[PDB]
Amino acid sequence: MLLPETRNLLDLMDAATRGGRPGLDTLPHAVGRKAVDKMSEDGEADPPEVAEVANGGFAGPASEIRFRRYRPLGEAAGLLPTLIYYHGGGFVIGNIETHDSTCRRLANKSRCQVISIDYRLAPEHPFPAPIDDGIAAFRHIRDNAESFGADAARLAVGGDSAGGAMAAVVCQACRDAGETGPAFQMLIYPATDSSRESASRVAFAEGYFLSKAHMDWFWEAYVPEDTDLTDLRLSPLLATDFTGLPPAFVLTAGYDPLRDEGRAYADRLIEAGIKTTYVNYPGTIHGFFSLTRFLSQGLKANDEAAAVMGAHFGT
Amino acid sequence: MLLPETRNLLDLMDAATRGGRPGLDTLPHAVGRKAVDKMSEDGEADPPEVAEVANGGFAGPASEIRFRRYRPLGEAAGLLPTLIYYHGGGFVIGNIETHDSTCRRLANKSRCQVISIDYRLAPEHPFPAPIDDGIAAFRHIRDNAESFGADAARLAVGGDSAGGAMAAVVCQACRDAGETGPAFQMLIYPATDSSRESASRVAFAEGYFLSKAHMDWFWEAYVPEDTDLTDLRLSPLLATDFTGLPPAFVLTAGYDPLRDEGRAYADRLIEAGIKTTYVNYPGTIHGFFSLTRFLSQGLKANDEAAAVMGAHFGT
Ligand SMILES: *[PH](O)(CCCCCC)OC
Ligand SMILES: *[PH](O)(CCCCCC)OC
Ligand SMILES: *[PH](O)(CCCCCC)OC
Ligand SMILES: *[PH](O)(CCCCCC)OC
């Protein structure tokens, strides 16, 4: 079943609930964001040193998109293979700060540059604003690669949860528009299907950090009521054609409601003849990739994602 | 579709055939071994420098088992996480020399020690002698880890084709005997099922480096007449229980008859709750992992296998 480290964390969370700490799904979105963002920052392992961290912004579709560039230790080349990273948080919470230690570790272990994107969040900017920012961040960095110290031939996208969905959708959007898309996609327990409930979405509705109530709280902020749940920006698993999508790494957690649709996305990539790495981390929960203060499996997952991307890019 | 580099290699093969070269499947096994072993040595990328190479032998079940240890560049620790590697060659051909460059690259990229095993070959030593040697090599190195500069907590087995089968069977054998098994299994396009012909075994019977005629020539040498093809040492895919097997990396090639049964083995591991990485390299052939003079994809596969094992072992 669950690893000891995982049970330890679920026990702490259960102790906070009995200790009267409110459910996330009972608060206003902006209030929940402030509280959970601090816990996410605190829940990361200590930030490793990198060669260089850069902060800036560029003109997005409807706002300034902030970015943070992480230059890996021991790499001297001007133009580096580069991962454009989209943080998770149901398109409502998270930011560059909540995923900073993780991006630092990914940069160092991959010997690739990481560029973390601060995309617009719901409920202030509902669907499709977050994905529009994700797409615009990829296009801007692609077209201005030298500005970002990026090798345009080795531009990856990736993220965790909503960020994973974003990375999958960025690849499909570029493919569908007939433009140059990412060289690589790193999908960490992505949400790939909003149209159906998989066996895993039912089985893990409760008891496993990310609960159905949490997904509904995110959903009510992000998605207008009238929206077709088969829209490929909500449900990229439903794409008719997976050919011409870039080589992928797809990671699931065993006790994650998103596991089945994560693995189905990998299956569609494999059947389409896309170079695809699929890994399942049994005995851990959704979020473990960034909860690395509590879950050592997350540091292992960080290193596996980094190592596979690094190997694809010949770093 | 086949990758250009793969078509280039199939062209060279076709140029040798119409001309001086005869079919491998037309020669006595010991004479075919000499010719194909030289092509395998010649087909590897130039050997990268490692920190140290050690040659020795120990008493196996029925003979001396030769080994070669590769110490990775830049690792100082006395006891290293260690991959025990079993070369491919249908249990008939290959040796330490045919997989030397690949083992050097795996050692350097993983920051793990590699110990390549020179197990007994058919037809001189038919089934089950090659697997007996594989099992005895793992047990000897496990029980004498400090003698091999190996951290007993981080002992992996792996191999390509027959070597992949060997690594899978070593893990099952240790699990079934109730002894300490490997910490990790690296299965490079393993043969996992001799009992049935998958869609891929039919589809790729010819046109792609190992033809069905090659598999029959190997089979004639390795398996005594009237052997049970459901024996778990020939057909580890048919194991009833995959629980308690070590964390795995499973790699298939797209145009490989072994692809489907390789992927099925990964599926059994995932369903049993084993931490499992599956990767498919589309557009390449069986053997590409060691044909790295001709196939860049092989060097990418080398680095992916190494990086995933390295990440599991926290190197
Ligand atoms: P992730 O970003 C999971 C929520 C999925 C978004 C629904 C569209 O939270 C850790
Ligand atoms: P979710 O299922 C996450 C909380 C973990 C509690 C462990 C039983 O909310 C009820
Ligand atoms: P590999 O070792 C081929 C697998 C056949 C195993 C059964 C004899 O190299 C072509
Ligand atoms: P097999 O299919 C090996 C493929 C070699 C390519 C050109 C001879 O032999 C028919």
XYZ file of C-alpha atoms and ligand atoms in Angstrom:
670
model
C 0.000 0.000 0.000
C 1.242 3.529 0.962
C 4.974 3.936 1.812
C 5.700 4.775 5.495
C 6.826 8.384 4.548
C 3.436 8.830 2.769
C 1.384 7.501 5.743
C 3.437 9.843 8.058
C 2.408 12.864 5.916
C -1.307 11.832 5.584
C -1.278 11.397 9.439
C 0.107 14.982 9.981
C -2.615 16.325 7.597
C -5.317 14.309 9.512
C -3.886 15.714 12.854
C -4.271 19.303 11.497
C -7.959 18.550 10.493
C -8.831 17.122 13.986
C -6.731 20.093 15.343
C -9.465 22.297 13.738
C -7.423 23.638 10.703
C -10.060 24.366 7.992
C -10.576 22.344 4.767
C -9.102 24.226 1.731
C -12.515 23.749 -0.048
C -14.309 25.889 2.675
C -12.360 29.191 2.043
C -12.479 32.021 -0.552
C -9.961 31.209 -3.379
C -7.675 34.246 -2.652
C -7.636 33.295 1.132
C -6.916 29.569 0.421
C -4.161 30.603 -2.067
C -2.228 32.630 0.584
C -2.328 29.811 3.201
C -1.654 26.813 0.875
C 1.097 28.743 -1.060
C 3.029 29.172 2.284
C 2.599 25.409 3.058
C 3.817 24.550 -0.515
C 6.909 26.832 -0.112
C 7.552 25.206 3.325
C 6.831 21.660 1.920
C 9.708 21.753 -0.642
C 13.194 20.380 0.253
C 15.838 23.114 0.983
C 16.735 24.944 -2.280
C 20.022 23.645 -3.812
C 22.546 26.243 -5.121
C 22.469 26.675 -8.935
C 24.986 28.598 -11.129
C 22.613 31.579 -11.588
C 18.947 32.599 -10.984
C 17.396 35.286 -13.246
C 14.068 37.135 -12.674
C 12.221 39.024 -15.421
C 8.911 39.444 -17.231
C 7.753 39.745 -20.848
C 4.522 40.993 -22.473
C 1.943 38.168 -22.436
C -1.421 38.159 -24.283
C -3.219 40.190 -21.543
C -0.556 40.943 -18.849
C 3.160 40.749 -17.958
C 4.223 37.056 -17.552
C 6.954 36.804 -14.831
C 9.662 34.110 -15.347
C 12.578 32.731 -13.325
C 15.589 31.156 -15.128
C 17.779 28.611 -13.308
C 21.270 28.002 -14.775
C 22.570 24.520 -13.726
C 25.878 24.117 -11.760
C 28.877 23.120 -13.938
C 27.395 24.095 -17.380
C 29.370 26.898 -19.164
C 27.711 26.962 -22.690
C 25.824 30.222 -23.536
C 22.848 28.428 -25.170
C 21.540 25.571 -22.955
C 18.901 22.909 -23.538
C 15.958 24.476 -21.661
C 12.831 23.221 -19.829
C 9.941 25.730 -19.671
C 8.249 24.679 -16.393
C 4.596 25.298 -15.415
C 3.894 24.892 -11.636
C 0.801 22.937 -10.474
C -2.055 24.166 -8.227
C -5.302 23.442 -10.163
C -4.803 26.705 -12.143
C -5.684 28.516 -8.857
C -2.641 28.245 -6.487
C 1.146 27.869 -6.807
C 3.657 30.298 -8.364
C 7.431 30.442 -9.077
C 8.116 30.499 -5.267
C 6.146 27.255 -4.502
C 8.220 25.216 -7.075
C 11.594 27.066 -6.722
C 13.529 24.235 -4.893
C 12.115 21.671 -7.397
C 13.124 23.782 -10.467
C 16.625 24.284 -8.930
C 16.990 20.481 -8.452
C 15.621 19.745 -12.007
C 18.126 22.259 -13.503
C 21.139 20.751 -11.603
C 20.204 17.061 -12.211
C 19.314 17.547 -15.946
C 22.227 19.989 -16.687
C 19.443 21.925 -18.542
C 18.260 25.498 -17.941
C 14.797 25.637 -16.264
C 12.463 28.647 -16.901
C 9.568 28.654 -14.415
C 6.498 30.607 -15.666
C 4.159 32.714 -13.472
C 0.972 32.276 -15.573
C -2.348 34.020 -14.698
C -4.465 32.092 -12.137
C -8.213 31.489 -11.626
C -10.547 32.665 -10.287
C -9.270 36.184 -11.241
C -8.374 34.861 -14.761
C -10.523 31.805 -15.559
C -10.112 29.300 -18.420
C -8.754 29.793 -21.000
C -6.384 32.540 -19.599
C -3.916 30.194 -17.771
C -3.341 28.016 -20.919
C -3.150 31.154 -23.165
C -0.253 32.364 -20.887
C 1.413 28.900 -20.983
C 1.202 28.857 -24.822
C 2.411 32.520 -25.071
C 5.383 31.774 -22.710
C 6.506 28.860 -24.945
C 6.078 30.904 -28.198
C 7.887 33.978 -26.764
C 10.852 31.898 -25.464
C 10.965 29.807 -28.681
C 11.089 32.966 -30.902
C 13.588 34.767 -28.537
C 15.637 31.675 -27.458
C 19.061 33.490 -27.460
C 17.565 36.165 -25.051
C 16.781 33.340 -22.561
C 20.190 31.567 -23.002
C 18.189 28.747 -24.660
C 19.189 26.393 -27.512
C 16.024 26.651 -29.728
C 16.704 23.051 -30.966
C 16.375 21.785 -27.307
C 13.303 23.543 -25.832
C 11.158 21.343 -23.542
C 7.879 22.168 -21.729
C 6.775 20.467 -18.502
C 4.890 20.854 -15.245
C 3.061 19.088 -12.400
C -0.742 18.606 -12.360
C -2.368 21.668 -13.973
C 1.215 22.496 -15.119
C 1.412 19.006 -16.724
C -1.973 19.578 -18.420
C -0.575 22.977 -19.585
C 2.589 21.320 -21.055
C 0.475 18.636 -22.868
C -1.879 21.359 -24.248
C 1.044 23.646 -25.332
C 2.407 20.689 -27.433
C -1.048 19.940 -29.009
C -1.684 23.696 -29.665
C 1.678 24.096 -31.547
C 1.056 20.813 -33.474
C -2.558 21.905 -34.391
C -1.418 25.460 -35.492
C 1.302 23.825 -37.686
C 4.176 25.740 -35.947
C 7.448 24.568 -34.285
C 6.490 22.954 -30.941
C 8.620 21.847 -27.954
C 11.394 19.234 -28.515
C 10.228 17.433 -25.316
C 7.303 17.302 -22.842
C 7.749 16.407 -19.120
C 4.239 15.551 -17.751
C 4.270 15.110 -13.926
C 0.910 13.529 -12.840
C -0.992 15.696 -15.360
C -4.794 16.138 -15.486
C -5.546 14.947 -19.093
C -9.341 14.250 -19.009
C -12.077 16.448 -17.426
C -14.857 14.652 -19.470
C -14.950 11.305 -17.559
C -14.116 9.854 -14.101
C -11.480 7.056 -14.414
C -11.438 4.103 -11.938
C -8.570 5.986 -10.131
C -10.624 9.276 -9.820
C -13.377 7.204 -8.021
C -11.071 4.947 -5.897
C -9.012 7.959 -4.556
C -11.887 10.544 -4.283
C -10.904 10.853 -0.632
C -8.160 10.108 1.854
C -5.125 11.101 -0.455
C -3.964 14.767 -0.069
C -5.823 15.818 -3.364
C -9.508 15.014 -2.683
C -12.608 15.332 -4.997
C -13.772 18.366 -2.896
C -10.348 20.035 -3.650
C -10.806 19.346 -7.428
C -14.364 20.902 -7.306
C -13.027 24.038 -5.452
C -10.337 24.377 -8.203
C -12.966 23.581 -10.907
C -15.565 26.207 -9.721
C -12.767 28.912 -9.916
C -11.191 27.807 -13.263
C -14.024 26.663 -15.605
C -17.110 28.659 -16.702
C -20.305 26.525 -16.220
C -21.150 26.574 -19.991
C -17.799 24.914 -21.034
C -17.638 21.732 -23.175
C -15.703 19.260 -20.918
C -14.363 17.598 -24.166
C -12.552 20.887 -25.060
C -8.951 19.693 -25.800
C -7.581 22.461 -23.453
C -9.464 20.748 -20.528
C -9.248 17.180 -21.898
C -6.114 16.745 -24.085
C -6.459 12.904 -23.644
C -9.407 13.148 -26.163
C -7.159 14.345 -29.067
C -8.042 12.302 -32.230
C -4.381 12.364 -33.435
C -1.253 12.044 -31.170
C 1.256 11.887 -34.111
C 3.754 14.804 -34.438
C 3.689 15.406 -30.626
C 7.177 15.631 -29.072
C 8.994 12.878 -27.119
C 7.533 12.613 -23.598
C 8.198 11.642 -19.990
C 4.928 10.838 -18.113
C 4.965 10.224 -14.324
C 2.002 8.996 -12.200
C 1.688 8.474 -8.412
C 0.020 5.186 -7.305
C -2.553 6.832 -4.930
C -3.442 9.731 -7.272
C -6.974 10.141 -8.739
C -5.174 11.436 -11.924
C -3.095 8.199 -12.255
C -5.293 6.386 -14.863
C -5.699 9.377 -17.270
C -1.938 10.141 -16.859
C -1.108 6.571 -17.923
C -3.772 6.638 -20.714
C -2.025 9.792 -22.109
C 1.319 7.878 -22.163
C -0.503 4.922 -23.877
C -1.871 7.260 -26.627
C 1.703 8.642 -27.166
C 3.224 5.093 -27.350
C 0.513 3.824 -29.820
C 1.133 6.957 -32.016
C 4.879 6.034 -32.263
C 6.081 8.927 -30.004
C 9.257 8.179 -27.962
C 7.619 7.923 -24.500
C 8.960 7.208 -20.989
C 6.176 6.265 -18.510
C 6.942 5.787 -14.771
C 4.549 4.926 -11.918
C 5.644 5.711 -8.315
C 3.435 3.354 -6.253
C 2.726 4.090 -2.563
C 2.863 7.914 -2.936
C 0.224 10.641 -3.503
C -0.472 13.520 -5.904
C 1.935 16.420 -5.060
C 4.943 14.271 -3.969
C 7.124 15.783 -6.789
C 7.135 19.155 -4.911
C 6.442 17.974 -1.253
C 10.111 16.889 -1.028
C 10.625 18.076 2.613
C 8.251 15.186 3.620
C 8.483 12.715 0.665
C 12.019 11.546 -0.363
C 10.265 9.662 -3.266
C 9.726 13.199 -4.682
C 13.509 13.844 -4.796
C 13.850 10.462 -6.617
C 11.066 11.521 -9.054
C 12.797 14.956 -9.506
C 16.084 13.142 -10.383
C 14.358 10.636 -12.739
C 12.462 13.406 -14.649
C 15.745 15.476 -14.832
C 17.909 12.477 -15.854
C 15.505 11.384 -18.674
C 15.251 14.964 -20.079
C 19.073 15.380 -19.743
C 19.606 12.077 -21.600
C 17.171 13.063 -24.427
C 19.083 16.381 -24.835
C 22.539 14.690 -24.637
C 23.615 16.840 -21.629
C 8.405 4.854 -39.588
C 12.093 3.735 -39.284
C 14.489 6.599 -38.405
C 16.917 7.700 -41.163
C 19.977 6.435 -39.130
C 18.205 3.004 -38.895
C 17.545 2.923 -42.697
C 21.277 3.850 -43.230
C 22.238 0.762 -41.143
C 19.698 -1.584 -42.891
C 21.272 -0.315 -46.206
C 24.843 -1.277 -45.043
C 23.455 -4.731 -43.962
C 21.776 -5.155 -47.422
C 25.119 -4.116 -49.133
C 27.019 -6.848 -47.177
C 24.328 -9.504 -48.053
C 24.273 -8.914 -51.862
C 28.065 -9.557 -52.059
C 30.645 -11.374 -49.852
C 28.619 -12.093 -46.641
C 26.483 -15.233 -45.974
C 23.531 -15.550 -43.515
C 24.395 -16.046 -39.787
C 21.696 -18.832 -39.700
C 23.686 -20.930 -42.323
C 26.859 -21.458 -40.149
C 27.831 -23.772 -37.253
C 27.200 -21.846 -33.963
C 30.894 -21.664 -32.838
C 32.008 -20.319 -36.300
C 29.040 -17.837 -36.577
C 29.917 -16.615 -33.022
C 33.449 -15.529 -34.189
C 32.134 -13.519 -37.208
C 29.129 -11.822 -35.497
C 31.194 -11.139 -32.275
C 33.741 -9.154 -34.429
C 30.868 -7.149 -36.059
C 29.405 -6.466 -32.544
C 32.835 -5.231 -31.254
C 33.147 -3.074 -34.448
C 29.479 -1.878 -34.123
C 29.945 -0.285 -30.635
C 30.880 3.437 -30.274
C 34.588 4.075 -29.353
C 35.100 3.040 -25.683
C 34.906 6.059 -23.301
C 37.612 6.302 -20.587
C 36.430 5.139 -17.125
C 38.248 5.563 -13.761
C 39.305 1.880 -13.655
C 38.682 -1.472 -15.429
C 39.198 -4.740 -13.481
C 39.313 -8.303 -14.934
C 38.851 -11.437 -12.800
C 36.912 -14.692 -12.427
C 35.151 -16.595 -9.627
C 33.927 -20.208 -9.232
C 30.487 -20.593 -10.858
C 28.174 -23.649 -10.607
C 30.087 -25.662 -13.283
C 32.972 -23.372 -14.444
C 34.938 -20.147 -13.842
C 32.702 -17.083 -14.537
C 34.885 -14.191 -15.894
C 33.819 -10.614 -14.942
C 34.886 -7.079 -15.892
C 34.320 -4.189 -13.416
C 34.041 -0.598 -14.677
C 34.549 2.208 -12.108
C 32.850 5.468 -13.285
C 34.847 8.735 -13.800
C 34.577 11.163 -10.833
C 33.292 8.683 -8.146
C 35.641 8.325 -5.086
C 33.560 6.080 -2.699
C 34.950 2.548 -2.036
C 31.487 0.885 -2.126
C 29.516 1.986 -5.232
C 25.943 1.320 -6.317
C 26.581 -1.493 -8.820
C 24.885 -2.836 -11.979
C 25.596 -6.514 -12.746
C 25.272 -6.551 -16.555
C 24.430 -9.575 -18.738
C 25.316 -9.072 -22.462
C 22.815 -10.137 -25.168
C 23.378 -12.629 -28.024
C 20.489 -15.156 -27.788
C 22.481 -17.089 -25.114
C 24.784 -18.141 -28.036
C 26.980 -15.088 -28.965
C 28.327 -11.925 -27.274
C 30.803 -11.643 -24.380
C 32.401 -8.909 -22.215
C 34.263 -7.545 -25.332
C 31.065 -7.071 -27.464
C 29.399 -4.850 -24.752
C 32.565 -3.161 -23.336
C 31.954 0.392 -24.779
C 28.256 0.219 -23.696
C 29.166 -0.879 -20.103
C 31.807 1.933 -19.951
C 29.142 4.493 -21.039
C 26.520 3.038 -18.578
C 29.073 3.252 -15.703
C 30.015 6.921 -16.527
C 26.392 8.132 -17.103
C 24.902 6.325 -14.036
C 27.903 7.098 -11.709
C 27.438 3.382 -10.757
C 29.965 0.538 -11.020
C 29.114 -1.912 -13.868
C 30.184 -5.618 -13.582
C 29.820 -7.365 -16.954
C 29.424 -11.174 -16.632
C 30.851 -13.717 -19.119
C 28.203 -16.451 -18.604
C 28.357 -19.883 -20.335
C 26.925 -19.919 -23.902
C 24.890 -22.444 -25.945
C 25.252 -24.724 -27.776
C 28.265 -25.858 -25.641
C 26.189 -25.107 -22.465
C 22.455 -25.196 -23.290
C 19.501 -24.059 -21.118
C 19.517 -23.829 -18.162
C 23.347 -23.255 -17.887
C 23.423 -19.562 -19.029
C 20.696 -18.565 -16.453
C 22.365 -20.730 -13.720
C 25.562 -18.627 -14.315
C 23.548 -15.353 -14.275
C 21.903 -16.369 -10.953
C 25.266 -17.570 -9.480
C 27.004 -14.279 -10.543
C 24.326 -12.192 -8.718
C 24.470 -14.425 -5.574
C 28.314 -14.435 -5.489
C 28.542 -10.619 -5.888
C 25.641 -10.051 -3.424
C 27.338 -12.243 -0.732
C 30.855 -10.784 -1.474
C 29.729 -7.158 -2.271
C 32.672 -5.428 -0.462
C 35.120 -7.644 -2.502
C 33.583 -6.172 -5.741
C 33.576 -2.550 -4.419
C 29.753 -2.834 -4.369
C 27.231 -1.294 -1.922
C 25.075 -4.390 -1.076
C 22.069 -2.020 -0.508
C 22.327 -0.855 -4.209
C 22.941 -3.966 -6.380
C 21.129 -3.869 -9.754
C 20.979 -6.540 -12.481
C 20.410 -5.725 -16.160
C 21.132 -6.752 -19.723
C 20.039 -6.586 -23.385
C 17.894 -9.316 -25.024
C 18.958 -12.680 -23.574
C 20.776 -10.558 -20.944
C 17.458 -8.764 -20.203
C 15.695 -12.157 -19.906
C 18.566 -13.232 -17.575
C 18.125 -10.124 -15.341
C 14.293 -10.646 -15.203
C 14.801 -14.356 -14.295
C 17.509 -13.593 -11.649
C 14.951 -11.274 -9.900
C 12.126 -13.895 -10.047
C 14.551 -16.667 -8.861
C 15.630 -14.645 -5.744
C 11.970 -13.674 -5.043
C 10.765 -17.348 -5.463
C 13.625 -18.716 -3.234
C 12.817 -16.121 -0.509
C 16.378 -14.628 -0.551
C 17.695 -11.017 -0.909
C 17.241 -10.100 -4.609
C 18.545 -7.163 -6.704
C 17.617 -3.564 -5.666
C 16.885 -2.778 -9.353
C 16.411 -4.483 -12.757
C 17.371 -2.774 -16.080
C 15.644 -4.794 -18.884
C 16.833 -3.675 -22.366
C 14.477 -5.195 -25.018
C 14.293 -8.466 -23.035
C 12.830 -11.753 -24.342
C 10.085 -12.464 -21.720
C 7.851 -15.071 -23.483
C 8.978 -18.159 -25.484
C 5.459 -19.787 -25.169
C 3.487 -17.490 -27.575
C 4.097 -15.264 -30.656
C 2.995 -11.633 -29.978
C 1.685 -9.421 -32.845
C 5.215 -7.823 -32.882
C 7.004 -11.256 -33.243
C 4.807 -11.879 -36.390
C 4.967 -8.295 -37.838
C 8.839 -8.152 -37.567
C 9.632 -11.819 -38.485
C 11.888 -10.275 -41.248
C 13.383 -6.975 -42.544
C 14.855 -5.705 -39.236
C 18.281 -6.969 -37.991
C 17.056 -10.133 -35.877
C 14.879 -12.161 -38.270
C 12.810 -15.240 -37.205
C 15.543 -17.397 -38.902
C 18.119 -15.770 -36.438
C 15.776 -16.572 -33.480
C 15.480 -20.268 -34.670
C 19.332 -20.552 -35.019
C 19.650 -19.167 -31.420
C 16.733 -21.411 -30.272
C 18.265 -24.636 -31.827
C 21.484 -23.990 -29.796
C 19.939 -22.822 -26.468
C 16.865 -25.045 -25.836
C 16.956 -28.875 -25.669
C 14.125 -30.572 -27.652
C 10.964 -31.185 -25.513
C 11.680 -28.301 -23.039
C 8.464 -26.848 -21.458
C 8.180 -23.405 -23.215
C 6.166 -22.152 -20.147
C 9.237 -22.724 -17.891
C 9.591 -19.324 -16.064
C 13.366 -19.309 -16.944
C 12.356 -19.173 -20.695
C 9.041 -17.308 -20.203
C 9.223 -15.029 -17.122
C 6.201 -13.044 -18.524
C 4.031 -16.074 -17.394
C 4.844 -15.592 -13.650
C 1.507 -15.719 -11.688
C 2.845 -13.239 -9.054
C 4.914 -10.073 -9.882
C 4.723 -8.682 -6.266
C 8.060 -8.308 -4.356
C 10.043 -7.911 -7.647
C 12.529 -5.011 -7.584
C 11.957 -1.577 -9.174
C 12.478 -1.802 -12.949
C 13.458 0.050 -16.124
C 12.049 -1.657 -19.278
C 13.101 -0.447 -22.756
C 11.644 -1.642 -26.099
C 12.595 -0.804 -29.717
C 9.670 0.025 -32.085
C 10.687 -2.387 -34.930
C 11.692 -5.267 -32.581
C 9.799 -8.616 -32.558
C 10.374 -8.592 -28.722
C 8.622 -5.175 -28.330
C 5.123 -6.451 -27.293
C 6.356 -9.001 -24.670
C 8.828 -6.371 -23.324
C 5.951 -3.899 -22.840
C 3.687 -6.677 -21.413
C 6.412 -7.392 -18.775
C 6.417 -3.668 -17.779
C 2.548 -3.804 -17.643
C 2.685 -6.825 -15.245
C 5.206 -4.915 -13.027
C 3.040 -1.715 -12.989
C -0.212 -3.664 -12.183
C 1.623 -5.503 -9.313
C 2.549 -2.098 -7.739
C 6.301 -2.274 -8.634
C 7.989 1.115 -9.292
C 8.457 0.758 -13.094
C 9.872 2.965 -15.886
C 8.824 1.834 -19.411
C 10.283 3.543 -22.534
C 9.676 2.738 -26.226
C 12.267 3.915 -28.814
C 10.176 3.973 -32.025
C 11.885 3.740 -35.446
C 14.857 1.631 -34.228
C 15.651 -2.107 -34.214
C 16.621 -4.846 -31.749
C 20.373 -4.383 -30.933
C 20.447 -0.536 -31.164
C 21.544 -0.245 -27.461
C 24.983 -1.718 -28.401
C 25.195 -0.737 -32.183
C 26.164 2.813 -31.110
C 28.816 3.348 -33.871
C 25.839 3.480 -36.340
C 22.788 4.377 -34.158
C 22.889 7.622 -32.047
C 19.508 6.457 -30.596
C 21.564 3.725 -28.834
C 23.722 6.345 -27.034
C 20.456 8.121 -26.013
C 19.054 4.777 -24.736
C 22.403 4.102 -22.914
C 22.136 7.539 -21.175
C 18.412 7.112 -20.344
C 18.946 3.603 -18.811
C 22.027 4.957 -16.871
C 20.289 8.174 -15.704
C 17.145 6.301 -14.443
C 19.265 3.736 -12.525
C 21.462 6.604 -11.176
C 18.314 8.483 -10.028
C 16.903 5.365 -8.266
C 20.256 4.952 -6.417
C 20.604 8.721 -5.625
C 23.971 9.019 -7.479
P -2.711 20.158 -9.495
O -2.492 21.401 -10.324
C -4.268 19.235 -9.730
C -5.566 19.922 -10.150
C -5.960 19.638 -11.605
C -6.601 20.839 -12.313
C -8.018 20.574 -12.817
C -8.187 21.138 -14.218
O -2.671 20.343 -7.852
C -1.617 19.901 -7.001
P -8.234 14.361 1.282
O -8.586 12.924 1.114
C -6.549 14.632 1.948
C -6.260 14.541 3.475
C -5.406 13.376 3.999
C -6.056 12.675 5.202
C -5.639 11.210 5.328
C -6.808 10.291 5.695
O -9.181 15.155 2.320
C -10.003 14.385 3.192
P 19.410 -11.129 -28.034
O 20.146 -11.853 -26.940
C 17.984 -12.016 -28.756
C 16.936 -12.702 -27.842
C 16.553 -14.183 -28.007
C 16.543 -14.933 -26.662
C 16.069 -16.383 -26.852
C 17.166 -17.295 -27.395
O 20.350 -10.659 -29.309
C 19.932 -10.728 -30.664
P 16.442 -9.762 -41.176
O 15.081 -9.189 -41.367
C 17.661 -8.462 -40.883
C 17.521 -7.168 -41.705
C 18.735 -6.900 -42.577
C 18.513 -5.751 -43.566
C 19.147 -6.016 -44.940
C 19.711 -7.426 -45.106
O 16.976 -10.502 -42.501
C 16.031 -10.577 -43.581
